[PDB]
């Protein structure tokens, strides 16, 4: 028994990331066509929550408005897929996609026709967070980095500020790793491993956007998307297809 109180915020970026992280949404089917539509409807709500989150990230609102909109359009799938991997990893109940507490997709549904090829890519993130035993603090830092990982080939209007902000979260990820109390050698190796995982998110996202864009465009397929998601995808596609989305990588590849 303790009184009602808000936990103590400290002067560190990760303490702030923890307070601004949105609460997990509840969603509120045995056919791939129906499952897909349902996932999209959830996704639109999660994306609205993500925009509100990004505006709270120290430095973000100081970027030109066009910069903010572009970063969100380029990175939303990465942010949604990484958070899905996290919820699924933290479920610790086997190969299961935890879209929401009331919307879990088990092995049986993941193997329905038309589902496996898309679910396997989402599951990959989960198994990687699990293999590396990623901590909540590391996850919050990495998730922020995904918002700052895809830029226009021609550069942002607020390029210098963006670079500074990005470096701030790269260091914060380094502090989250150090905090686990491994030795110097383990710290170096872990930074390597987590930055490799960040880089691998670009490939995951390419696989997901392929489904996103095709299902959105083929109106005959009758897969529905909410308004917010529809508007973003509508604006993203031209940039994506024109090869304008530059992926920032930690490793040469």
């Amino acid at each position: 028994m303790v009184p009602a109180a808000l936990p103590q915020l400290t002067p560190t970026l990760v303490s702030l990331l923890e307070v601004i992280e949105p609460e997990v949404l509840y969603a509120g089917p045995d056919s791939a066509w129906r499952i897909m539509t349902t996932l999209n409807m959830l996704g639109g709500r999660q994306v609205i929550a993500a925009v509100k989150w990004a505006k709270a990230i120290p430095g973000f609102r100081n970027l030109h408005l066009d910069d903010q909109m572009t970063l969100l359009q380029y990175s939303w799938m990465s942010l949604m897929a990484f958070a899905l991997g996290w919820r699924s990893y933290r479920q610790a109940s086997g190969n299961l996609l935890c879209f929401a507490p009331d919307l879990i997709i088990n092995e049986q549904r993941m193997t329905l026709p038309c589902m496996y090829d898309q679910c396997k890519h989402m599951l990959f993130i989960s198994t990687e967070l699990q293999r590396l035993q990623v901590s909540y603090e590391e996850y919050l830092c990495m998730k922020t980095l995904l918002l700052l990982s895809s830029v226009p080939k021609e550069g942002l209007k607020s390029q210098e500020l963006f670079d500074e902000i990005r470096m701030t979260y790269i260091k914060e990820l380094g502090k989250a790793i150090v905090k686990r109390e491994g030795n110097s050698s383990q710290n170096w190796q872990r930074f390597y491993q987590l930055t490799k995982l960040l880089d691998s998110m670009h490939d995951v996202v390419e696989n997901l956007l392929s489904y996103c864009f095709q299902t959105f465009l083929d109106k005959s397929m009758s897969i529905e998307f909410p308004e917010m998601l529809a508007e973003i995808i509508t604006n993203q596609i031209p940039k994506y297809s024109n090869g304008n989305i530059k992926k920032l990588l930690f490793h040469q590849k």
């Binding site: 609205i48 925009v51 509100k52 505006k55 408005l65 903010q68 909109m69 969100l72 359009q73 308004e227 917010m228 508007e231 973003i232 604006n235």
Partner: peptide, 10 residues
């Protein structure tokens, strides 16, 4: 064009 995203961001 991006009215919804713009609104949310303002």
């Amino acid at each position: 064009e991006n009215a919804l995203l713009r609104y949310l961001l303002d």
